[PDB]
Amino acid sequence: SPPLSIMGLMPLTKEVAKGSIGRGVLPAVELAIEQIRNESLLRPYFLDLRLYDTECDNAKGLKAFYDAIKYGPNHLMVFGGVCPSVTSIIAESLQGWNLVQLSFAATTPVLADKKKYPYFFRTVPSDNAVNPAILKLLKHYQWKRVGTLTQDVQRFSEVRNDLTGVLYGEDIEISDTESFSNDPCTSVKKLKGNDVRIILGQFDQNMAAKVFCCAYEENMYGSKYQWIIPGWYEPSWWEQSRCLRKNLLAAMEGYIGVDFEPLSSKQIKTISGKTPQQYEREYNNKRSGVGPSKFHGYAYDGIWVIAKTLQRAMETLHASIQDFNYTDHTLGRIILNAMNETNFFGVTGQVVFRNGERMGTIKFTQFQDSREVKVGEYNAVADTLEIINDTIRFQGSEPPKDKTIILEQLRKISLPLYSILSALTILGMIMASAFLFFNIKNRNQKLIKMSSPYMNNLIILGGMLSYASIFLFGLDGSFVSEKTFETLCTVRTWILTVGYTTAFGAMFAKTWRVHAIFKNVKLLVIVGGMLLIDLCILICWQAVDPLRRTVEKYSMEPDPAGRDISIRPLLEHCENTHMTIWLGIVYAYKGLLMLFGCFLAWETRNVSIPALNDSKYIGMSVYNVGIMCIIGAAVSFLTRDQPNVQFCIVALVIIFCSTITLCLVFVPKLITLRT
Amino acid sequence: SERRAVYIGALFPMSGGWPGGQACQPAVEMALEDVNSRRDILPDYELKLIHHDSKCDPGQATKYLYELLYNDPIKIILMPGCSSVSTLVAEAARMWNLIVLSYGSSSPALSNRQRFPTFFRTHPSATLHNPTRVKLFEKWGWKKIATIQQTTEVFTSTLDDLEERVKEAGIEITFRQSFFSDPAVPVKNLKRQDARIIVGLFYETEARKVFCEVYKERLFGKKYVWFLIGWYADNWFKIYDPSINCTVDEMTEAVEGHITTEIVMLNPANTRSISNMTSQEFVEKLTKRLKRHPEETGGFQEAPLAYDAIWALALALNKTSGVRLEDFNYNNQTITDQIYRAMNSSSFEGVSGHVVFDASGSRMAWTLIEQLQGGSYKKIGYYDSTKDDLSWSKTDKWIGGSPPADQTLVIKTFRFLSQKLFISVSVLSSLGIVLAVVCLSFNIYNSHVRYIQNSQPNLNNLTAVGCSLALAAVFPLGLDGYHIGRNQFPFVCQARLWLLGLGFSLGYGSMFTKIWWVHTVFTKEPWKLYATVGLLVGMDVLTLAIWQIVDPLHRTIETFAKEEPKEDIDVSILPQLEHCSSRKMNTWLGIFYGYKGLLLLLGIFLAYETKSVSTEKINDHRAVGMAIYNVAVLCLITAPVTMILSSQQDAAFAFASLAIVFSSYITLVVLFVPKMRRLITRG
Ligand SMILES: CC(C)CCC[C@@H](C)[C@H]1CC[C@H]2[C@@H]3CC=C4C[C@@H](O)CC[C@]4(C)[C@H]3CC[C@]12C
Ligand SMILES: CC(C)CCC[C@@H](C)[C@H]1CC[C@H]2[C@@H]3CC=C4C[C@@H](O)CC[C@]4(C)[C@H]3CC[C@]12C
Ligand SMILES: CC(C)CCC[C@@H](C)[C@H]1CC[C@H]2[C@@H]3CC=C4C[C@@H](O)CC[C@]4(C)[C@H]3CC[C@]12C
Ligand SMILES: CC(C)CCC[C@@H](C)[C@H]1CC[C@H]2[C@@H]3CC=C4C[C@@H](O)CC[C@]4(C)[C@H]3CC[C@]12C
Ligand SMILES: CC(C)CCC[C@@H](C)[C@H]1CC[C@H]2[C@@H]3CC=C4C[C@@H](O)CC[C@]4(C)[C@H]3CC[C@]12C
Ligand SMILES: CC(C)CCC[C@@H](C)[C@H]1CC[C@H]2[C@@H]3CC=C4C[C@@H](O)CC[C@]4(C)[C@H]3CC[C@]12C
Ligand SMILES: CC(C)CCC[C@@H](C)[C@H]1CC[C@H]2[C@@H]3CC=C4C[C@@H](O)CC[C@]4(C)[C@H]3CC[C@]12C
Ligand SMILES: CC(C)CCC[C@@H](C)[C@H]1CC[C@H]2[C@@H]3CC=C4C[C@@H](O)CC[C@]4(C)[C@H]3CC[C@]12C
Ligand SMILES: CC(C)CCC[C@@H](C)[C@H]1CC[C@H]2[C@@H]3CC=C4C[C@@H](O)CC[C@]4(C)[C@H]3CC[C@]12C
Ligand SMILES: CC(C)CCC[C@@H](C)[C@H]1CC[C@H]2[C@@H]3CC=C4C[C@@H](O)CC[C@]4(C)[C@H]3CC[C@]12C
Ligand SMILES: CC(C)CCC[C@@H](C)[C@H]1CC[C@H]2[C@@H]3CC=C4C[C@@H](O)CC[C@]4(C)[C@H]3CC[C@]12C
Ligand SMILES: CC(C)CCC[C@@H](C)[C@H]1CC[C@H]2[C@@H]3CC=C4C[C@@H](O)CC[C@]4(C)[C@H]3CC[C@]12C
Ligand SMILES: CC(C)CCC[C@@H](C)[C@H]1CC[C@H]2[C@@H]3CC=C4C[C@@H](O)CC[C@]4(C)[C@H]3CC[C@]12C
Ligand SMILES: CC(C)CCC[C@@H](C)[C@H]1CC[C@H]2[C@@H]3CC=C4C[C@@H](O)CC[C@]4(C)[C@H]3CC[C@]12C
Ligand SMILES: CC(C)CCC[C@@H](C)[C@H]1CC[C@H]2[C@@H]3CC=C4C[C@@H](O)CC[C@]4(C)[C@H]3CC[C@]12C
Ligand SMILES: CC(C)CCC[C@@H](C)[C@H]1CC[C@H]2[C@@H]3CC=C4C[C@@H](O)CC[C@]4(C)[C@H]3CC[C@]12C
Ligand SMILES: C[C@H](NC[C@H](O)CP(=O)(O)CC1CCCCC1)c1ccc(Cl)c(Cl)c1
């Protein structure tokens, strides 16, 4: 029985950290060879593994590899290698000796290249094997906006650089890209500035607590945000500081950890004749001295791959091993093609190599309040994701979307308030029509003939046109159209200034003729000239810069509904060109005319008996109509943002201003003409 | 002659990325003869060489290092080639206790005494350009630097040492970039960032792309200066390359006048080394042994260094022979410690000059600084760094005679009113003040005669003394920088604010009450007149006191957009205009202007009302109405204009003081000349 020697390199001391891996798979490989000798897989010969300790160091590993070449027997292929640097040094140099290497723990992506390392094969999936998993998670939840948060080590920069190249060609954009070295959360504040809710974190075990407590200080959790991080951390890793524990446990709820799957679940018979569960119980009975490690199934599949490759190579050679020196290379090409042709079923799934990488399975886990639990899997051979339905949950009800939805939600005015004010002004309209009917019925009278009743007809028509404006005031928003609004406001400012000008010109002309008759110790051209001036400024308004619709928008502040969308409240206005020119001139001209009329009414202060019987209450009405019009225009300047209020207070000011001056002219008429 | 052997293992790269061993291999062997013939040093030993090709590839250097370390003749030192092979060999040689003495490894990562404990090299590291660049930054006063970079790790460690070197000399990097194969977007960001001191760090085949992209985006020129690395070929822009849409006659204007720095291998002097040899005869002797020309073989420039490397080892075996060397095995740690202490302190004169190592294993040497000047390089200086000796040679031909500066400088010029329009209006104001005081004295002199005693005394005098101060309030309206300095702007400001307000309020209050009382007595007693005047003046000084309390006035500078001088070619000039203001200057005089406008418009109507229906022959005015007419038409036309045109330099002062001199001339002409035309002309 000639032996078949296999070189094994693994950390086998207790003084290093990753040496805890190297002992932990030593039962399982011991479990495998005893099967291959029992069935007599290598009938012509028998397998023999020779162990060597590299101690996870470049110099020690290179010296041990050289001593294993020099003093040991004729090896055929290398098995093992755990640390990334020592595997890099050996894997670059295998080709000079025509040896093929098979790893089970080298998870670095650098060994994916087949120009530098052409004789390398591993059975553990790499660190880039999570990148076509997260993609097929996003298409399951239709998320398309993501934001990456990367640590500045090479080990994570390779993963991020592969993710960039694998998201290309799809309907997924990378709205933000970040990096940090020691300061985590100015970067997550910049991520909060763009307001993204899907984060693909890539960072080690130390910075995770810092990122999550800095998110708790930023309140980046709840049923809005989603975290997707690696899942090869230690169990209960949160216990080892400054941050508060229960706050961290409330901030860390609901992340998705991505990892490689330790053992398969599809309970079929493998190539050894067992189940995954039987193998797990056997290895658990074997491992009684030491703790477990998550690489043992991959070591089992590696031993079976080595055995099947040697069997295929022997069957190929006998159709033309104990004489193999490193000077041969045709035997190396034979063993290389035989390992390239590997396709079978083992305890971790369908063992198959594509370009020197294992096409294996990826495991998603989610954190629930004390522990992480398996919430799905992704088979990368057939490219399919399987999510267990009744285990994955969120805080809210729906899977949270990437960006919030904006809504217009125009600010309207209350129909009860509008109806109440329309009723008030329509009863004022009835009162004004009743006063006009009385004064036109009692025309021929020796009290009405000496009181200039045509000017009173002018003041009733002015009050009528002032009353009629409130209907055209505030037909805004959700009431008529989008095209009447460009004409309704210009016809409103057409009618309102005429209704003001007629009445105030009548009262001012009455007071002016009182002063002119008093001084010397026909009519109707004054209001004609004033109407001419205001119609001129109105046609100059309409012909040059007409008032049109213009919308103002707020900054999307409130969220009052609870349906988790943002609303952006917006208002309508009739103002388009300059609005500090054609309002300041009109307001200043009307204010100066008002103050001149008020001073002229004070200068008499009721000394004239014979010609006009009512100059007293006419001057009282001028006084009246000035001050409340001033406070109405001032309060209109004050609350130029809020709607229900300014319409109501302008309506109250105008109904008071038009119902008091219609009382003070015609109320003595009723008392003296009924008596 | 016994002449026992001592062996030296070596890896010479015959091909690959840096084919140095085509020239470094004979230059070692020739040098070995010069140690084996001279009987002064190593009198009984004989150095022999065992070499292997390595192709600058660790995948074969590992096998050849196994062949060296595990065969019969015991080696005593190792001599690798490229950077990667030397990294592998120097990290691996700790477990066998071997000195590693490279000759061509220029990584900055090999100066880590923690990782590589027994390393020595004679090629200096690529962190020797950085003291030369720091010295060339302190010499010309530059203080802001942009760095573009190809993302190979050697350039990354070079810049990460440059930052630590430059932050202790008061200079700071403002801009970093990186690229892999297409330099378009970093030169775009360099164009939009507008930096002018660039330190480029990339290989040749990227330089031929990035410099004609610099030409296409027009980043070169009069105000720009680059910095490159010096071991390019001397016609690296004049060669043809189909990977760019750029022309050979083009980009020769774009690489114009860029400084390069490089290590100097061969000794520029002509003295004698320790081998009794000079530089030119060393090149002449070496050119015999080569089978080709020096321009076509690789590694010709590094071939001196290997020479000195051999000589260094020879001296390190002369200062220890006194344990013998025919007994060195791979386990005893002692003899390597003797050799390490002997080679830690080494200082001699070889073909490359003064050879002496650092404390981290590197080699300190000179630096050459050259510049492109019209298509060909020109040596413009040398620099020693271990004792800080610059050697300039007066050849830095710039474009404007002087080196440009990093950023454009701002000039905060001021803008003052022309002094002729100040001085003419001030002398008109002094003519006004003498006319006012002579009219006041004339009216106060005839205080008994019943033409002005019965009409209105003590009121026109008050109008005149109000207009006196109102005319005197135009001297502090034109004192900003040309005749006054600073830190008394509150004095001039409170002066102009109290003086003009007091004068106008007093004068118009008097002339307003003289119309108000005749109106209120015509339509059906000096104490009530004095009460009205004092009440108006008290209310006006009350609101000026409220101005004094809440928001006082101080100086405030505004500025316009920048302009161009067009006597230099690069200065940025911004104009500054300073004036008195407060935080609420538009409203806090808007109230005063509106109140005075309402008072003025009240007065003009009564002045028209009591025109010729006076019949009030106890006042005898008839022309105070005209004195209110002209002041009302003149102040209301220059009150909003001097707040509209406040951005203009001198038109505001012109209109304000012109209105003030007209409105104080005419109110004294039309009020006082009939008071003397009827008395001391009709006398
Ligand atoms: C729109 C509504 C509010 C307007 C109503 C106008 C009212 C206030 C007017 C119209 C008729 C007026 C009445 C006419 C007759 C009299 C009888 C007299 O001995 C007392 C006053 C009194 C009772 C008057 C009070 C005011 C009066 C009731
Ligand atoms: C009878 C006369 C006095 C009526 C004249 C109407 C005048 C005041 C109107 C007609 C056109 C208007 C102008 C229209 C355009 C502009 C340009 C803008 O950038 C500033 C305002 C300004 C300059 C407006 C000011 C007021 C204006 C000049
Ligand atoms: C009878 C005549 C003299 C009265 C004329 C009133 C004049 C002076 C008013 C009416 C319109 C006003 C203009 C309204 C708009 C503007 C545009 C602004 O950018 C500068 C001021 C300016 C130019 C105003 C100046 C004063 C103005 C021209
Ligand atoms: C009796 C009449 C002549 C008095 C009229 C007072 C006039 C001159 C006042 C009242 C409102 C004032 C305007 C208020 C607003 C502005 C807009 C500003 O951008 C330019 C100045 C300008 C245009 C002002 C000029 C002067 C002004 C038009
Ligand atoms: C007799 C009196 C009542 C007439 C006064 C005319 C007033 C109302 C006019 C003259 C100048 C005008 C101001 C001109 C400038 C501005 C600044 C602007 O950002 C807001 C509007 C505001 C503040 C205007 C509001 C109306 C205004 C104050
Ligand atoms: C901004 C401008 C257009 C506003 C001007 C307001 C004008 C129209 C006002 C102010 C003073 C008023 C005048 C006051 C006095 C008289 C004398 C009287 O026997 C005829 C009417 C007449 C002539 C008035 C007509 C209207 C009038 C001229
Ligand atoms: C909304 C509220 C504030 C508006 C109230 C309008 C007030 C201010 C008006 C309406 C009636 C007016 C009064 C009418 C009659 C007189 C009697 C007279 O000898 C003194 C003035 C006085 C007392 C007036 C003062 C102002 C007055 C009270
Ligand atoms: C908008 C507001 C400020 C306008 C108010 C107009 C005021 C100032 C008017 C309206 C009624 C007037 C009053 C009418 C009656 C009297 C009684 C008399 O023995 C003293 C003057 C006095 C007290 C008047 C002072 C001015 C007065 C109060
Ligand atoms: C004797 C003093 C107290 C009277 C002063 C009258 C004041 C209160 C009046 C005159 C001009 C008015 C302003 C006119 C314009 C605006 C701009 C608007 O967006 C807010 C209201 C505001 C700011 C008004 C508030 C009240 C106001 C400042
Ligand atoms: C809806 C309510 C508020 C409307 C009431 C209308 C009131 C204000 C009207 C109706 C009758 C009027 C009164 C008629 C008679 C007089 C007697 C006179 O010597 C003083 C005025 C006085 C006292 C009037 C004041 C105003 C008056 C009371
Ligand atoms: C006789 C007195 C009461 C008349 C005073 C007229 C006053 C009310 C006018 C003149 C200048 C005007 C101001 C012009 C500029 C501004 C700045 C703006 O951001 C808010 C409004 C505000 C503050 C205006 C409010 C009204 C204002 C202060
Ligand atoms: C905007 C402008 C028009 C408002 C001006 C308010 C004016 C009318 C007020 C403020 C101070 C008041 C004066 C206070 C003192 C006196 C002295 C007394 O023996 C006669 C009345 C008289 C002369 C008052 C008349 C009215 C008055 C002048
Ligand atoms: C904005 C400004 C112009 C409004 C000013 C309102 C002025 C005109 C009001 C407020 C107080 C009033 C005064 C109240 C008291 C008196 C005393 C009396 O014996 C004569 C009238 C007189 C002097 C009034 C005239 C008008 C008056 C001054
Ligand atoms: C701020 C307010 C009070 C200022 C108003 C200025 C007033 C008083 C000026 C402007 C226009 C002037 C009028 C111009 C034309 C006439 C027609 C003439 O046959 C009688 C005088 C009369 C009626 C003038 C009286 C005074 C007057 C009305
Ligand atoms: C801004 C502009 C419109 C204001 C102009 C103010 C004007 C209306 C004032 C200032 C000077 C006044 C004039 C003063 C002198 C006279 C001569 C007299 O025999 C007839 C009235 C008349 C002709 C006055 C009419 C009104 C007048 C012209
Ligand atoms: C009787 C009448 C003529 C007096 C009117 C007083 C006028 C001229 C005063 C009152 C308010 C003042 C305005 C206050 C605010 C501003 C806004 C500022 O950005 C430009 C100046 C401007 C536009 C002022 C110009 C002068 C102004 C319009
Ligand atoms: C000046 C420099 N001296 C040696 C250099 O530092 C050795 P290096 O640092 O190991 C880089 C090599 C390796 C790959 C191919 C050429 C460059 C140099 C650079 C490029 C070239 Cl092609 C040569 Cl010949 C020399």
User: What DSSP string describes B192-261?
Assistant: HHT--BEE----HHHHHHHHHHHHHHT--STT-B-EEES-S-TTSSSS--TTSS--SSSSTTTSTT-EEE
Decide if B201 contacts B147 (C-beta within 8 A): yes
Of residues A92, A596, A599, nearest to B59 (C-beta): A92
Q: Which residues from chain A sit within 8 angstroms of residue B598, using beta carbons? A: 595
B123 is in an annotated binding site: yes
Give the chain A residue whose CA is nearest to the CA of B63.
A96
Are the CB atoms for A154 and A208 separated by under 8 Å? no
The pair of three-digit structure tokens given for residue B158, joined into one six-digit string: 């070079």
Smallest Cα–Cα separation from A372: which of A264, A280, A266, A259?
A259
CB of A580 shorter than 6 A to ligand 4: yes
C-beta of A584 in contact with ligand 6 (< 6 A): no
Q: Give the pair of three-digit tokens for residue A58.
A: 């470049």
In A411-452, where does DSSP find H-type helix? 415-441
Q: Is the separation of the CB atoms in B468 and B436 below 8 Å?
A: yes
Does B51 show up as a binding residue in the annotation? no
CB A189 within 8 A of CB A217: no
Do A546 and A457 contact (CB within 8 A), yes or no?
no
Does B609 sit in the ligand 15 pocket, CB within 6 Å?
Answer: no
Domains of chain B and any CATH numbers: 4-123+302-344 (3.40.50.2300), 126-266+361-407 (3.40.50.2300), 421-551+588-677 (1.20.1070.10)
CA A577 to centroid of ligand 3, rounded, Å: 16
* Cβ contact A96–B95 (<8 Å): no
Q: Which residues of A fall within a CB distance of 8 Å from B92?
A: 58-59, 62-63
Q: Is the CB of B629 under 6 A from ligand 15?
A: yes
* Contact state of B69 with A69 under an 8 Å Cβ cutoff: no
DSSP state of B409: P
- The C-alpha atoms of residue A101 and residue A44 are separated, in whole angstroms, by 23
Q: CA B601, CA B603: separation in Å to the nearest integer?
A: 5
Estimate the share of chain A in helix, then strand, then coil, as percent rounded to the nearest 5: 50, 15, 35
Calpha distance A100→A79 (Å, rounded): 8
CA-CA distance, A481 to A460, in Å (whole number)? 33
With an 8 Å Cβ cutoff, the interface of chain A facing chain B consists of 58-60, 62-63, 66, 69-70, 89, 92-93, 95-97, 116, 519, 592, 595-596, 599, 603
Within 8 A by CB and 6+ apart from B316, the residues are: B339, B342, B343, B346
Q: How far apart are CA A421 and CA A410, in angstroms?
A: 22
In this structure, the number of other CB atoms found within 10 A of the CB of residue A473 comes to 19
Contacts 24+ apart (CB under 8 A), A238-244: A238/A209, A241/A209, A242/A213, A243/A209, A243/A213, A243/A216
Q: Do A66 and B69 touch (CB under 8 A)?
A: yes
- A533 CB less than 6 Å from ligand 6? yes
The DSSP annotation for B628-667 comes to HHHHHHHHHHHTTHHHHTTSSSSHHHHHHHHHHHHHHHHH
Instruction: Report the number of secondary-structure helices (H) and strands (E) in chain A.
Output: 20, 20
Nearest to residue B27, comparing CAs of B261, B220, B402, B306?
B306
Taking an 8 Å cut-off on Cβ atoms, the answer to whether A66 and B63 are in contact is no
Q: Is A620 in the pocket of ligand 7 (CB under 6 A)?
A: yes
Q: Is B59–A519 a contact, with Cβ atoms under 8 angstroms apart?
A: no
Q: Do A66 and B70 touch (CB under 8 A)?
A: yes
Contact call for B59 and A96, based on CB within 8 A: yes
| B464 touches B440 (CB < 8 A) | yes
Q: Closest partner residue to A96 among B60, B70, B94, by Cβ?
A: B60
Cβ B539 under 6 angstroms from ligand 12: no
Judged by its nearest atom, the ligand closest to the C-alpha of residue B633 is 15
**Chain A CB contacts of B94 below 8 Å:** 59
- The rounded distance, in Å, linking the Cα atoms of B602 and B593 is 14
Residue A349 pairs with which residues in a beta bridge?
Answer: A346
* A59 to B92: CB separation less than 8 angstroms, yes or no: yes
CA distance B492 to B480: 9
Shortest-distance ligand to the CA of residue B83? 17
Distance A534 CA to ligand 6 centre (A): 12
Give the pairing type, strands B144-147 and B198-199.
parallel
Q: Is B203 annotated as a binding residue?
A: yes
Q: How far apart are CA B145 and CA B407, in angstroms?
A: 10
Please, what's the b/e burial string for A494-506 (b: 16 or more CB within 10 A of its CB; e: otherwise)? bebbbbbbbbbbb
Q: Do A63 and B66 touch (CB under 8 A)?
A: no
Q: Is B293 annotated as a binding residue?
A: no
Is the distance from CB of A19 to CB of A89 less than 8 angstroms?
A: no
Task: Tell me which chain B residue has its CA closest to the CA of residue A58.
Answer: B92
| Cβ(B105)–Cβ(B128) below 8 Å | no
The amino acid present at A672, given as its one-letter code, is T
Pick the atom of ligand 9 nearest to A640's CA: 19
**CA nearest A300: which of A342, A357, A351?**
A351
Q: Which residues of A touch B601 (CB under 8 A)?
A: 592
Tokens standing for residue A259: 């990892």
Closest partner CB to A59 (pick from B66, B94, B613)? B94
- Does the annotation flag B302 for ligand binding? yes
CA distance A509 to A455: 9
Closest CA to B161 of B120, B113, B111: B111
Cβ contacts of B594 within 8 Å, gap of 6 or more: none
Inter-chain contact B63–A93, Cβ cutoff 8 Å? yes
Question: CB atoms < 10 A from the CB of B175, how many?
Answer: 17
Q: Are strands A357-358 and A349-354 parallel, antiparallel or unpaired?
A: antiparallel
Q: Which residues from A are below 8 Å from B62, CB to CB?
A: 62, 89, 92-93, 96
Of B263, B259, B262, B261, residue with least CA distance to B140:
B259
- Spatial contact of A476 and A572, defined as CB atoms under 8 Å apart: yes
> Which pair of tokens denotes residue B609?
């009302």
Interface contact B92-A92, CB threshold 8 A: no
Q: Which two tokens stand for residue A405?
A: 């939805």
Structure tokens at B194: 């507008």
Distance A514 CA to ligand 8 centre (A): 19
- What does the block give as tokens for A124? 């553990």
Cα of B595 from ligand 13 centre, angstroms: 14
A289 vs A268: CA distance, rounded Å: 30
Ligand nearest to the backbone CA of A513? 6
Q: Which residue of B has its CA nearest to A71?
A: B70
A431 Cβ below 6 A of ligand 10? no
Structure-token pair, residue A470: 């409130």
DSSP assignments along B262-317, one per residue: EE--S-SS----TTS--HHHHHHHHHHH-SS-TTTSSS-TTHHHHHHHHHHHHHHT
Rounded distance between C-alpha atoms, residue A324 and residue A326, angstroms: 7
Phi, psi of A298 (to 5 degrees): -70, -35
Q: Which ligand is nearest to the CA of A524?
A: 6
- Nearest Cα of chain A lies from the Cα of B591 at a distance, in angstroms, of 15
d(CA A308, CA B605): 119
Dihedral, CA of residue B470, residue B472, residue B476 and residue B479, to nearest 10:
130
Q: Cβ < 6 Å from ligand 8: which residues?
A: A 623, 627
For the stretch A343-366, what's the b/e string if a residue is b when 16 or more beta carbons lie within 10 angstroms of its beta carbon?
A: eebbbbbbbebeebbbbbbbbbbb
Cα-to-centroid distance, A628 and ligand 11 (Å) = 19
Name the residue facing A70 among B63, B70, B94 (closest C-beta): B70
* Token code pair at residue A469: 């404006």
